[PDB]
Symmetry: D2
Subunit: 145 residues, 4 copies
C-alpha cells in the first residue's frame, strides 16, 4: 500500500472517480484528489495538467485520469514529455501499459466501464512492473520529439 | 471517397495495418503508407512521427496509427500540439473521438481487435463530423500546454 | 415507445438494472421489473426464468437480463427453445444480435459496463429490425435440438 | 497439456478458428476440429451441436466455438442441459466463466477480436479452476429447466 496516487476527472467521470478513490482509500493507499469535486461542467485538460504536474514533480508515483471515454485525458496528458498515459478498457491493457510502456498514468473511461472492472484495471496497473528490455528504447524515443 | 489517409504501424500491428490499408484502397480512398513494410522488429514512435508530420503539414486529412495495443501510438502521437490521436476499440469510441474531440488520428490495437471490427471503427471515424459547441474550448485547452 | 420490456437481474447487477429500468421509464417505455429488488444475494437462473416466461407467453416484446458478467444469464436463458438471449458489451453487438440473430433478450454485464454505454446498447437493441434472409434458417436450426 | 479440446466454427470465424487450433497444437494440446473446413457459407448451429455432443459424451474436456460475433454459438450451445458456453471478449471474462460458471465451452467472436487476445482468453479459460462454493447451486439451477 506504499504507493501514492494523484487522481482527477471531469464532471462526466466524477462518479467513477469517486468510486476509484474510495476503493484505493479502503486499501490504505495515499490518494490526492485534484478534482473535479462535483458534476458541474468543467474542461478535462485543466484536470490532466494537475495530475501531470504531480507526476513530473515526483509528488505522486502514479496518476489516474478519467473522463467520459478516456479519449480527452489520453490526448491532453500525453502532451507532456515524461508522461505515459494509457487508456485501458480491461486489465490486460493495464498489464501491457506497465510491462511495455512503463505507463505512469492510467486513464479510465468513466461512462463506458463498470466500477468493478475499473478496480481490476487499477489493481493490475499498480501491481505490474516494467519489463525494461527492448521497450526502453521505445519509451525514450517517445520523448525525442 | 475524397479523403486522404496517412497510415503507419510497427511490426506487431503490420497485419492489421495491411488489411485496413487494403480496405481503404478498395473504396478508392487515397492512402499513403508510411510503413513499416514487414514484420521485422521496429520502434512505434518512429512511425507515429511520420503520420504526425503528414497531418501537421496538411498533407493528409486523417491519420491511422497501429501497434499491438494502441497504447504506444496513443502516447507518442499526442506529444505534438495539433494532434488528437484517439485509441478506439469499438465504433462508438470513434464516433465520440470525432464528435467531441475532433480527432485527427485514429489509433487501433493490431493484436487486440479483429479486422472487420477495425473496418467498422474506421468507417465511423471517417464519416463523423465534429460537433463544435462546448467541445471547442476543451480541444484548444489541450494545446495550451 | 410502444414496446414492452421485461427486466430482471441478480444482486450483482441490481444497480445497473435499476438505472436501465429508469432510463426506459423516462422514455415512456412500459417496463415490468421481475426483480431482484435488493442487493441481498440471489441466484441468477431464478430471474432468467421469469423474463423467459414473459417472452414465451407473449407478455413482453423484449427481455433484458443482467448479472455480474452476463455469462450466467446468457447460459440460463438460452436453455429455452424460442429464446435468443444475446450478451452485448457494445452497441454493434446489439445491432448484430437483432439484425442476424433476431434476439429477443438482451443480456448486459452489470459489473463490467458503464450505465451510459448500457443505455446506448439498449437503444440499439430496441431500434434494430431483423434482416431475415439467410439468417432465418440459422435461427430455426438453433431450436432443432 | 493433457487437456482435450473440441473446436468448431462457421465460415465467418474460420480464420480465427484455424489460428486458435494451431496455437493449441503448438503447445501439444490434443484438438479435434469438427469444422467447418473452408470459408464456404455454413450454419453455426450445425457446428455447435458437434462440439456439444463431444462434451456431453465426455469425449473432450472443453469446447471452443466461434462465429462472427459469438452470439449465435452462445445461443445454440446453451440449448443443451449440461453445457455452459461462455462468450468471452477478454481474459477476465474467461477467468470468471470458469471460476463462477464452471464453463465447459468457450465462445469467441471471430470477427471482433484479434488472435493474440483470443490466445490469452484461451490460456485463461484452460488454466482456471472452478471455485465451487455458492456458485454450484446456481449452475445446477440452470439445468432445472
Amino acid at each position: 500500500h506504499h504507493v501514492k496516487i494523484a487522481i482527477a476527472s471531469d464532471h462526466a467521470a466524477f462518479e467513477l472517480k469517486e468510486k476509484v478513490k474510495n476503493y484505493l482509500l479502503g486499501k490504505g493507499i495515499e490518494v490526492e484528489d485534484h478534482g473535479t469535486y462535483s458534476e458541474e461542467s468543467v474542461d478535462y485538460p485543466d484536470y490532466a495538467k494537475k495530475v501531470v504536474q504531480s507526476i513530473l514533480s515526483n509528488e505522486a508515483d502514479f496518476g489516474i485520469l478519467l473522463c467520459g471515454t478516456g479519449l480527452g485525458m489520453s490526448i491532453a496528458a500525453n502532451r507532456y514529455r515524461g508522461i505515459r498515459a494509457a487508456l485501458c478498457l480491461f486489465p490486460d491493457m493495464a498489464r501491457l501499459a506497465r510491462s511495455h510502456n512503463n505507463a505512469n498514468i492510467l486513464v479510465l473511461p468513466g461512462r463506458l466501464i463498470g466500477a468493478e472492472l475499473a478496480f481490476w484495471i487499477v489493481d493490475t496497473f499498480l501491481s505490474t512492473p516494467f519489463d525494461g528490455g527492448r521497450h526502453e528504447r521505445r519509451i525514450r524515443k517517445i520523448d525525442e520529439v
